[PDB]
Design an enzyme around this catalytic site. Structure first.
Site, PDB file in Angstrom:
ATOM      1  N   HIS E 201       1.101  -1.164   0.205  1.00 61.39           N
ATOM      2  CA  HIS E 201       0.224  -0.138   0.163  1.00 61.39           C
ATOM      3  C   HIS E 201       1.295   1.528   0.290  1.00 61.39           C
ATOM      4  N   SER E 205      -0.298  -1.219  -6.003  1.00 59.69           N
ATOM      5  CA  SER E 205       0.329  -2.129  -6.446  1.00 59.69           C
ATOM      6  C   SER E 205       0.802  -2.134  -8.108  1.00 59.69           C
ATOM      7  N   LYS E 227     -13.032  -9.679  -8.995  1.00 58.44           N
ATOM      8  CA  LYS E 227     -12.330 -10.495  -9.551  1.00 58.44           C
ATOM      9  C   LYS E 227     -11.366 -11.484  -8.177  1.00 58.44           C
ATOM     10  N   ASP E 228     -11.177 -11.377  -7.359  1.00 58.10           N
ATOM     11  CA  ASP E 228     -11.118 -11.998  -6.626  1.00 58.10           C
ATOM     12  C   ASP E 228     -11.664 -13.242  -6.231  1.00 58.10           C
ATOM     13  N   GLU E 271       8.428 -34.384   0.157  1.00 60.13           N
ATOM     14  CA  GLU E 271       7.304 -33.440  -0.422  1.00 60.13           C
ATOM     15  C   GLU E 271       7.666 -32.555  -2.023  1.00 60.13           C
TER      16      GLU E 271
HETATM   17  C1  HEM Z   1       2.877 -14.937   2.734  1.00 57.93           C
HETATM   18  C2  HEM Z   1       1.785 -15.008   1.385  1.00 57.93           C
HETATM   19  C3  HEM Z   1       1.333 -14.011   1.139  1.00 57.93           C
HETATM   20  C4  HEM Z   1       0.273 -14.086   0.959  1.00 57.93           C
HETATM   21  C5  HEM Z   1      -0.659 -13.840   1.614  1.00 57.93           C
HETATM   22  C6  HEM Z   1       0.576 -12.394   0.145  1.00 57.93           C
HETATM   23  C7  HEM Z   1       0.326 -11.215  -0.548  1.00 57.93           C
HETATM   24  C8  HEM Z   1       0.061 -10.412  -1.549  1.00 57.93           C
HETATM   25  C9  HEM Z   1      -0.799  -9.385  -1.944  1.00 57.93           C
HETATM   26  C10 HEM Z   1      -1.906  -9.387  -1.842  1.00 57.93           C
HETATM   27  C11 HEM Z   1      -0.385  -8.891  -3.215  1.00 57.93           C
HETATM   28  C12 HEM Z   1      -1.093  -7.918  -4.116  1.00 57.93           C
HETATM   29  C13 HEM Z   1      -0.977  -8.274  -5.616  1.00 57.93           C
HETATM   30  C14 HEM Z   1      -0.831  -9.514  -5.951  1.00 57.93           C
HETATM   31  O1  HEM Z   1      -2.250  -9.948  -5.931  1.00 57.93           O
HETATM   32  O2  HEM Z   1       0.374  -9.474  -6.084  1.00 57.93           O
HETATM   33  C15 HEM Z   1       0.946  -8.839  -2.727  1.00 57.93           C
HETATM   34  C16 HEM Z   1       1.835  -8.189  -3.884  1.00 57.93           C
HETATM   35  C17 HEM Z   1       2.862  -8.935  -3.222  1.00 57.93           C
HETATM   36  N1  HEM Z   1       4.039  -9.970  -3.195  1.00 57.93           N
HETATM   37 FE1  HEM Z   1       3.216 -11.085  -1.625  1.00 57.93          FE
HETATM   38  N2  HEM Z   1       1.803 -12.324  -0.558  1.00 57.93           N
HETATM   39  C18 HEM Z   1       2.705 -13.908   0.068  1.00 57.93           C
HETATM   40  C19 HEM Z   1       3.225 -13.847  -0.536  1.00 57.93           C
HETATM   41  C20 HEM Z   1       4.314 -12.975  -0.935  1.00 57.93           C
HETATM   42  C21 HEM Z   1       6.339 -13.728  -0.858  1.00 57.93           C
HETATM   43  C22 HEM Z   1       6.612 -15.259  -0.937  1.00 57.93           C
HETATM   44  C23 HEM Z   1       6.748 -13.188  -2.036  1.00 57.93           C
HETATM   45  C24 HEM Z   1       7.981 -12.990  -2.364  1.00 57.93           C
HETATM   46  C25 HEM Z   1       8.780 -13.541  -3.553  1.00 57.93           C
HETATM   47  C26 HEM Z   1       5.590 -12.470  -2.278  1.00 57.93           C
HETATM   48  C27 HEM Z   1       6.316 -11.061  -2.830  1.00 57.93           C
HETATM   49  C28 HEM Z   1       5.181  -9.760  -3.462  1.00 57.93           C
HETATM   50  C29 HEM Z   1       5.306  -9.344  -4.543  1.00 57.93           C
HETATM   51  C30 HEM Z   1       6.664  -8.786  -4.638  1.00 57.93           C
HETATM   52  C31 HEM Z   1       4.257  -8.149  -4.785  1.00 57.93           C
HETATM   53  C32 HEM Z   1       4.324  -6.396  -4.880  1.00 57.93           C
HETATM   54  C33 HEM Z   1       3.890  -6.402  -6.401  1.00 57.93           C
HETATM   55  C34 HEM Z   1       2.988  -6.788  -6.858  1.00 57.93           C
HETATM   56  O3  HEM Z   1       1.509  -7.020  -6.543  1.00 57.93           O
HETATM   57  O4  HEM Z   1       2.765  -6.261  -7.904  1.00 57.93           O
HETATM   58  N3  HEM Z   1       4.692 -12.025  -1.693  1.00 57.93           N
HETATM   59  N4  HEM Z   1       1.160  -9.838  -2.165  1.00 57.93           N
HETATM   60  C1  LIG Z   2     -11.417  -8.974   8.451  1.00 56.94           C
HETATM   61  C2  LIG Z   2     -10.336  -8.607   7.420  1.00 56.94           C
HETATM   62  C3  LIG Z   2      -9.581  -7.581   6.446  1.00 56.94           C
HETATM   63  C4  LIG Z   2      -9.080  -7.609   5.160  1.00 56.94           C
HETATM   64  C5  LIG Z   2      -7.631  -8.131   4.890  1.00 56.94           C
HETATM   65  C6  LIG Z   2      -6.918  -8.809   3.681  1.00 56.94           C
HETATM   66  C7  LIG Z   2      -6.973  -7.156   2.834  1.00 56.94           C
HETATM   67  O1  LIG Z   2      -5.135  -7.501   2.557  1.00 56.94           O
HETATM   68  O2  LIG Z   2      -7.884  -8.353   1.919  1.00 56.94           O
HETATM   69  C8  LIG Z   2      -6.719  -8.494  -0.141  1.00 56.94           C
HETATM   70  C9  LIG Z   2      -6.914  -6.611  -0.134  1.00 56.94           C
HETATM   71  C10 LIG Z   2      -5.395  -9.042  -0.261  1.00 56.94           C
HETATM   72  N1  LIG Z   2      -5.255  -8.655  -1.292  1.00 56.94           N
HETATM   73  C11 LIG Z   2      -5.490  -7.514  -2.176  1.00 56.94           C
HETATM   74  O3  LIG Z   2      -6.353  -6.519  -1.801  1.00 56.94           O
HETATM   75  C12 LIG Z   2      -4.958  -7.375  -3.209  1.00 56.94           C
HETATM   76  C13 LIG Z   2      -4.211  -6.218  -3.783  1.00 56.94           C
HETATM   77  C14 LIG Z   2      -4.622  -5.957  -5.792  1.00 56.94           C
HETATM   78  C15 LIG Z   2      -5.149  -6.800  -6.312  1.00 56.94           C
HETATM   79  C16 LIG Z   2      -5.859  -8.464  -5.627  1.00 56.94           C
HETATM   80  N2  LIG Z   2      -6.372  -9.302  -6.405  1.00 56.94           N
HETATM   81  C17 LIG Z   2      -5.790  -9.618  -7.744  1.00 56.94           C
HETATM   82  O4  LIG Z   2      -6.210  -8.529  -8.783  1.00 56.94           O
HETATM   83  C18 LIG Z   2      -5.845  -8.177  -4.534  1.00 56.94           C
HETATM   84  O5  LIG Z   2      -6.910  -9.003  -3.913  1.00 56.94           O
HETATM   85  C19 LIG Z   2      -5.475 -10.498   0.374  1.00 56.94           C
HETATM   86  O6  LIG Z   2      -3.873 -10.740   0.080  1.00 56.94           O
HETATM   87  O7  LIG Z   2      -5.814 -10.329   2.476  1.00 56.94           O
HETATM   88  C20 LIG Z   2      -4.774  -9.991   2.881  1.00 56.94           C
HETATM   89  C21 LIG Z   2      -3.927 -10.318   3.095  1.00 56.94           C
HETATM   90  C22 LIG Z   2      -5.587  -9.135   3.847  1.00 56.94           C
HETATM   91  O8  LIG Z   2      -5.773 -10.453   4.839  1.00 56.94           O
HETATM   92  C23 LIG Z   2      -4.401 -11.506   4.882  1.00 56.94           C
HETATM   93  O9  LIG Z   2      -4.171 -10.359   6.280  1.00 56.94           O
HETATM   94  C24 LIG Z   2      -5.542 -12.455   6.351  1.00 56.94           C
HETATM   95  C25 LIG Z   2      -4.322 -12.964   7.065  1.00 56.94           C
HETATM   96  C26 LIG Z   2      -3.421 -12.918   7.177  1.00 56.94           C
HETATM   97  C27 LIG Z   2      -4.830 -14.302   7.990  1.00 56.94           C
HETATM   98  C1  LIG Z   3      11.068 -26.552  13.433  1.00 54.34           C
HETATM   99  C2  LIG Z   3      11.610 -25.878  12.315  1.00 54.34           C
HETATM  100  C3  LIG Z   3      12.920 -26.126  11.711  1.00 54.34           C
HETATM  101  C4  LIG Z   3      14.725 -27.068  12.837  1.00 54.34           C
HETATM  102  C5  LIG Z   3      13.647 -25.729  10.813  1.00 54.34           C
HETATM  103  C6  LIG Z   3      13.332 -26.208   8.993  1.00 54.34           C
HETATM  104  C7  LIG Z   3      13.902 -24.981   8.220  1.00 54.34           C
HETATM  105  C8  LIG Z   3      13.279 -25.967   6.690  1.00 54.34           C
HETATM  106  C9  LIG Z   3      13.129 -25.614   5.401  1.00 54.34           C
HETATM  107  C10 LIG Z   3      12.587 -23.716   5.016  1.00 54.34           C
HETATM  108  C11 LIG Z   3      12.834 -26.376   4.713  1.00 54.34           C
HETATM  109  C12 LIG Z   3      12.696 -27.551   5.199  1.00 54.34           C
HETATM  110  C13 LIG Z   3      13.197 -25.854   3.097  1.00 54.34           C
HETATM  111  C14 LIG Z   3      12.315 -25.749   1.607  1.00 54.34           C
HETATM  112  C15 LIG Z   3      13.866 -26.830   2.909  1.00 54.34           C
HETATM  113  C16 LIG Z   3      15.519 -26.004   2.578  1.00 54.34           C
HETATM  114  C17 LIG Z   3      14.415 -28.119   1.593  1.00 54.34           C
HETATM  115  C18 LIG Z   3      15.083 -29.152   1.820  1.00 54.34           C
HETATM  116  C19 LIG Z   3      14.238 -30.273   2.093  1.00 54.34           C
HETATM  117  O1  LIG Z   3      15.175 -31.594   1.792  1.00 54.34           O
HETATM  118  C20 LIG Z   3      14.339 -32.737   2.319  1.00 54.34           C
HETATM  119  C21 LIG Z   3      16.046 -33.096   2.450  1.00 54.34           C
HETATM  120  O2  LIG Z   3      16.911 -33.502   1.627  1.00 54.34           O
HETATM  121  C22 LIG Z   3      14.956 -34.884   2.579  1.00 54.34           C
HETATM  122  O3  LIG Z   3      16.176 -36.272   2.016  1.00 54.34           O
HETATM  123  C23 LIG Z   3      16.071 -37.611   2.526  1.00 54.34           C
HETATM  124  C24 LIG Z   3      14.122 -35.436   3.101  1.00 54.34           C
HETATM  125  C25 LIG Z   3      12.943 -34.268   2.633  1.00 54.34           C
HETATM  126  O4  LIG Z   3      11.725 -34.422   3.081  1.00 54.34           O
HETATM  127  C26 LIG Z   3      11.245 -36.066   3.786  1.00 54.34           C
HETATM  128  C27 LIG Z   3      13.645 -33.154   2.190  1.00 54.34           C
HETATM  129  C28 LIG Z   3      12.591 -31.545   2.751  1.00 54.34           C
HETATM  130  O5  LIG Z   3      11.096 -32.439   2.804  1.00 54.34           O
HETATM  131  C29 LIG Z   3      13.194 -30.945   2.189  1.00 54.34           C
HETATM  132  C30 LIG Z   3      11.586 -29.968   2.281  1.00 54.34           C
END
Ligand code: HEM
Ligand SMILES: CCCCC[C@H]1C(=O)O[C@@H](C)[C@H](NC(=O)c2cccc(NC=O)c2O)C(=O)O[C@H](C)[C@@H]1OC(=O)CC(C)C
Ligand SMILES: C/C=C(C)/C=C/C=C/[C@H](C)[C@H](C)[C@H](C)[C@H](C)CCc1oc2c(O)c(OC)cc(OC)c2c(=O)c1C
Ligand code: HEM
Ligand code: HEM
Ligand code: FES
Lengths: 59, 49, 78, 66, 379, 241, 100
Positions: E201, E205, E227-228, E271
């Protein structure tokens, strides 16, 4: 003329609309299930317990 | 046991091959298997620890 | 960032119609489907290649493996 | 009482592939049991057969089973 | 304010993140991934919270408990199914979400991106645990490596592990203390996710063209809300389909056999949503190297923002890096296959290879094809 | 040699994403388990309770469970004592503990068949094959004392002797109790056993699919309906000159 | 042997950002420099650029593009910002150096 009759009477007043969603859902449910259940069961004639329940309850 | 390219051991986790002595020969394993403290008490007896 | 403080926009006339006065369906078979292909054919030659390449490397890899398993009728002709 | 399996394995054991396989095996079998010292095993060849046999064994077996 | 939708401390937030939020007009599905990711976070937290209502974290009862939770609790089976699969729909969306972000340089919103990583990491972390919980052959042996995986870190390692998990070997304690982490963690993901969106925010976006959108921007609500809801049902149908038709389709069956501390299954395939990094790990023969590789295998995302050279943001006008990109996405789908594959010449090499293109494509190729394309424009 | 043979696919009566299990077949599947596998193969996660309404009748299963005595709670004087198996008991364990079983089965451990079908890749297809599929080891290959060759099993040497031949029992319904046949019925059971939800789960899947079918388009219209405002739209730049 | 000229032409049509009908510069990500650059733009070209971007967006948002006719031709692409942007940069590099 259905659609028009519908809108005016059912979809216009946000009050009404909702009311038909409800009474509608009740109808959709009851009907969707019976339909589904039938479709399903029929695709499995003589395999379900409902279907063999009888060799200790005939058929 | 009884699997691998060194007639000793193989660990299906990451491909470490062991020889019948328990040494690591191929793979990512770092040190050879653990050799516990032990001794034989007779012709057919073996005590570990 | 909110609304009304986004950009200094001058001279842009936009005309749009209520959704009820227009049709959402849209114009498939006219502009619809056409553009779809206009795209499958545009990126097909940019996406598919690598995937295709993988495939090969997958098959090759698998067959060969499945081969290195079968015996050489001549590992013992004697 | 006769097991539809054995009957259906009879037919199947005749399909072109089985034969072109059952043969491939028969040789190997008597190709290994003919020598004193050989590491060869006719497992592979055995499978190829089975693999093929049972394959149609399946395409039909469950038809006679209730 | 007669508004209210803006005059109420709480109520505003909503009518400020779901209604009235300025979003770019032009936005592909690749933007839903995230809103989906949420729904997963939910579906996971909801189902799992509910599944924990029947779990019994303790070796002797752990495995069975789940079974009971299925066979005995009404729809308990459905809950489980849904859960284990949400796991995937979760990783899928995340894996795609990262994709999108990578190829529209959304990673330029740095913070929103960095937080993102964290989420991934955690989602990977939390999913590691939890899978231990059912205490199956896999559960156990995964616990034993992944954990032991911190063996590598010198000095503080051997120790950190004999602590990571219970005492000195994955045993009951490790289990209870994992359940706890699992039960806890998701709520962290939720929190960070908040932090994630906050950072977002701050900076609107993105948008597929990678050029200012203030020129357009439509009210989040009317549009994107729908859309969502749509994308909700779309990538909801598969996930459900699985859960109702072929649940274990993605789930290794080997884990259906209660844990045995004495025998790790010949054929331990981690996995799917983990395989890639898995491969990388084994194709670098050296405990440390193995781990290190892995470490960066995922902990590399943090550098993508610095490995951006294109004068343009997204790369829709960068046909060159563009295919380099898919060379990557595929180079990933590869590592994966090579991960679900035992270690023999036909593979292995393929492995360490892709497990080389991976890095290079990122660390080097991209930034090079990057500046290059700029010069093919006099930049 | 990591060389193995992969089990052929049988068109099971319940393979279809929309096809339930042939409950009749399970009934027999049960009997074959009870009468021949439940003497080596424990099946701890099921219980007569289930059979009721799925392949047996209340009274049927009750008297069915009477058929076994179970060790139960402390006396007043506190001492385990046996008593008629009620309806809620779980299928009897053949051995007090594994190592006990291992000492009964030539040093092997007959795995519990609760989740067998989904604990071995191939499920029924595997299991079925395994049963109906023993034979003389090809040449050069020699199974040791106590084991029995079975190509489909990894190692090809199993600790389980072919536990199923023609007639081994007699399905009280009048079914040619042939090996192939019985072996089929055992597998269809092993399935339900592994996941009783099966049917309920697919039926569900059915409906779930009819909702997607119905819901997604609806919201699609809605999504388009709403966007048309933009899809339709038209620009134009009109400066003064 | 192979003209960089001949090449650029390639990339240009390859990038195909002209299919949306916007000049090269209409694309360069907006970083600190560019912003200042664009903020120096004569109001003429600014509103021009704007519309071109909004049109671009509007297209993109419709998934459809500009008739083969309206694409902009490589040779006719107007580097309307490169000049300002450059001064900017050197202005900066001048300052950055002086602060040492
Ligand atoms: C924990 C789960 C995650 C949720 C629920 C989440 C949620 C969001 C949402 C909804 C947006 C809005 C725009 C869109 O939908 O793309 C967003 C944007 C973005 N998230 Fe996440 N995200 C998550 C994980 C991640 C992860 C793992 C990455 C890491 C690479 C990431 C990178 C981004 C980026 C780069 C944007 C901004 C740019 C854009 O929206 O075009 N997010 N994320
Ligand atoms: C009481 C409820 C409050 C609403 C909370 C809820 C709120 O951010 O809802 C949307 C906006 C959020 N994504 C977007 O806004 C969004 C942004 C750009 C484009 C799109 N669409 C693509 O076309 C989106 O959909 C979506 O990713 O959920 C989040 C992350 C959050 O909720 C999460 O914390 C919940 C987790 C913490 C349990
Ligand atoms: C409580 C949490 C603690 C201690 C921290 C742990 C950290 C977790 C990290 C992010 C996780 C494994 C990542 C996906 C890593 C990089 C990938 C590697 C990874 O390696 C494996 C592996 O070498 C195996 O050899 C037989 C068997 C496996 O499963 C049966 C896995 C496995 O499941 C994952 C996945
Ligand atoms: C009853 C119809 C029956 C079935 C069904 C059956 C199946 C079965 C499976 C699927 C396995 C093995 C799977 C694997 O890969 O390990 C298995 C294993 C053993 N069985 Fe069995 N079995 C049936 C019946 C019986 C009976 C009556 C006995 C005891 C006489 C028996 C024993 C065993 C043993 C021992 C194994 C061990 C396999 C090994 O470790 O080598 N089975 N059975
Ligand atoms: C962040 C999302 C979550 C992830 C990634 C996740 C993932 C998992 C996974 C993969 C397992 C193993 C399932 C299997 O055996 O196939 C699991 C198990 C479990 N999870 Fe989660 N979980 C999450 C959140 C939750 C939540 C919020 C709770 C409750 C606090 C929870 C409680 C459990 C329980 C009860 C189990 C044990 C039973 C079972 O194995 O199915 N999970 N979780
Ligand atoms: S666990 Fe032995 S190869 Fe890694």
């Amino acid at each position: 003329t259905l659609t028009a009759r519908l809108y005016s009477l059912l979809f216009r007043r946000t009050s009404t609309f909702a009311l038909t969603i409800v009474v509608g859902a009740l109808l959709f449910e009851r009907a969707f299930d019976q339909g589904a259940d039938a479709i399903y069961e029929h695709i499995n004639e003589g395999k379900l317990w409902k279907h063999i329940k009888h060799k200790y309850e005939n058929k | 046991a009884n699997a691998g390219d060194f007639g000793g051991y193989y660990c299906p986790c990451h491909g470490s091959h062991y020889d019948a002595s328990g040494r690591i020969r191929k793979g990512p394993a770092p040190l050879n298997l653990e050799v516990p403290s032990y001794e034989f008490t007779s012709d057919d007896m073996v005590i570990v620890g | 960032r909110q609304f009304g403080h986004l950009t200094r926009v001058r001279h842009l006339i936009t005309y749009s119609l209520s959704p009820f006065e227009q049709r959402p369906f849209p114009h498939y078979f006219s502009k619809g489907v056409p553009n779809v292909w206009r795209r499958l054919r545009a990126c097909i030659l940019r996406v598919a290649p690598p995937f295709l390449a993988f495939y090969l490397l997958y098959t090759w890899g698998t067959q060969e493996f499945e081969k290195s398993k079968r015996k050489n009728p001549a590992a013992y002709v004697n | 009482l006769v097991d539809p399996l054995t009957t259906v394995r009879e037919q199947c054991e005749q399909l072109e592939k089985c034969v072109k396989a059952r043969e491939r095996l028969e040789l190997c079998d008597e190709r290994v049991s003919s020598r004193s010292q050989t590491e060869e095993d006719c497992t592979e060849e055995l499978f190829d057969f089975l693999h093929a046999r049972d394959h149609c064994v399946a395409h039909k077996l469950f038809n006679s089973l209730k | 304010a007669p508004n209210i939708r803006k005059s109420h401390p709480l109520l505003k937030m909503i009518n400020n993140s779901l209604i009235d939020l300025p979003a770019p007009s032009n936005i592909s599905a690749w933007w839903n991934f995230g809103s989906l990711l949420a729904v997963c976070l939910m579906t996971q937290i909801l189902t799992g919270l509910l599944l924990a209502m029947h779990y019994t974290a303790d070796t002797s009862l752990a495995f069975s408990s789940v079974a009971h939770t299925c066979r005995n609790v009404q729809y308990g089976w459905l809950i489980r199914n849904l859960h284990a699969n949400g796991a995937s729909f979760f990783f899928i969306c995340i894996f795609l979400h990262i994709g999108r972000g990578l190829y529209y340089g959304s990673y330029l919103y740095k913070e929103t991106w960095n937080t993102g990583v964290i989420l991934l990491l955690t989602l990977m972390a939390t999913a590691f645990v939890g899978y231990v919980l059912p205490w199956g052959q896999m559960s156990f042996w995964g616990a034993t490596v992944i954990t032991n995986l911190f063996s590598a870190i010198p000095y503080i390692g051997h120790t950190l592990v004999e602590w990571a998990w219970g005492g000195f070997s994955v045993d009951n304690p490790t289990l209870t203390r994992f359940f706890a982490l699992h039960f806890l963690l998701p709520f962290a993901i939720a929190g960070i996710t908040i932090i994630h969106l906050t950072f977002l925010h701050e900076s609107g976006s993105n948008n597929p063209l990678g050029i200012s959108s203030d020129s357009d921007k439509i009210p989040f609500h009317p549009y994107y809300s729908f859309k969502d809801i749509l994308g909700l049902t779309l990538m909801l149908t598969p996930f459900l389909t699985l859960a109702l038709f072929s649940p274990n389709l993605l789930g290794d069956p080997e884990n259906f056999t209660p844990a045995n501390p004495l025998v790790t299954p010949p054929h331990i395939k981690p996995e799917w949503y983990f395989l890639f990094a898995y491969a990388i790990l084994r194709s670098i023969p050296n405990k440390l190297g193995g781990v290190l590789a892995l470490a960066a295998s995922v902990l590399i995302l943090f550098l993508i923002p610095f490995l951006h050279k294109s004068k343009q943001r997204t790369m829709t006008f960068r046909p060159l890096s563009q295919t380099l990109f898919w060379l990557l996405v595929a180079n990933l789908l590869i590592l994966t296959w090579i991960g679900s594959q035992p270690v023999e010449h036909p593979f292995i090499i393929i492995g360490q290879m892709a497990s080389l293109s991976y890095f290079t494509i990122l660390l080097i190729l991209f930034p090079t094809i990057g500046t290059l394309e700029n010069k093919m424009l006099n930049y | 040699s990591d060389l193995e043979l992969h089990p052929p696919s049988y068109p099971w009566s319940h393979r279809g994403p929309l096809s339930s299990l042939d409950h009749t077949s399970i009934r027999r599947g049960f009997q074959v388990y009870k009468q021949v596998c439940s003497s080596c193969h424990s099946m701890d996660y099921v219980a007569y309770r289930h059979l009721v309404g799925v392949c047996y009748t209340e009274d049927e299963a009750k008297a069915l469970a009477e058929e076994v005595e179970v060790q139960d709670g402390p006396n007043e004087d506190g001492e385990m004592f046996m008593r008629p198996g009620k309806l809620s008991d779980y299928f009897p364990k053949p051995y007090p503990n594994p190592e006990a079983a291992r000492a009964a089965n030539n040093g092997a451990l007959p795995p519990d068949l609760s989740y067998i079908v989904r604990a071995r890749h191939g499920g029924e297809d595997y299991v079925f094959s395994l049963l109906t599929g023993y034979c003389e080891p090809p040449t050069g290959v020699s199974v040791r004392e106590g084991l029995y060759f079975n190509p489909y099993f990894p190692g090809q040497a199993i600790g389980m002797a072919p536990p199923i031949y023609n007639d081994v029992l007699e399905f009280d319904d009048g079914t040619p109790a042939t090996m192939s046949q019985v072996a089929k019925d055992v597998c269809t059971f092993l399935r339900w056993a592994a996941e009783p939800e099966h049917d309920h789960r697919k039926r569900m899947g059915l409906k779930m699919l009819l909702m997607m079918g119905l819901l997604v388009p609806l919201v699609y219209y809605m999504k388009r309906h709403k966007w048309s405002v933009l899809k339709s739209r038209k620009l134009a730049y009109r400066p003064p000159k | 042997s192979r003209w960089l000229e001949g090449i650029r032409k390639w990339y240009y049509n390859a990038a195909g950002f002209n299919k949306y009908g916007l000049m090269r510069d209409d694309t360069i990500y907006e970083n600190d420099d560019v912003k200042e650059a664009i903020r120096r733009l004569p109001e003429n070209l600014y509103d021009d650029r704007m519309f071109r971007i909004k049109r671009a967006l509007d297209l993109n948002m419709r998934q459809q593009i500009l008739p083969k006719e309206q694409w902009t031709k490589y040779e006719e692409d107007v580097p309307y910002l490169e000049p300002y942007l450059k001064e900017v940069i050197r202005e900066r590099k001048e300052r950055e150096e002086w602060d040492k």
